[PDB]
Amino acid sequence: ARKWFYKDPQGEIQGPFTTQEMAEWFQAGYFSMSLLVKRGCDEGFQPLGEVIKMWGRVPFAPG
């Protein structure tokens, strides 16, 4: 399922991406803790560090 979005430094929304695509980019080091991310169904973009705090784990991993 394609459901992940992020905002690039120029404010443009990118997506939708699969969880596996996000996991790949996260493990490769492309995503900082300040990157604004959300699922389509979510209310608002949040920094990835805060998403991890909210979810209790990195959201792209198995749970």
Binding site: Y6, D8, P9, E12, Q14, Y30, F31
Partner: peptide, 8 residues
Amino acid sequence: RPPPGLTN
């Protein structure tokens, strides 16, 4: 492929 928009 790098993530669009993040690496120019």
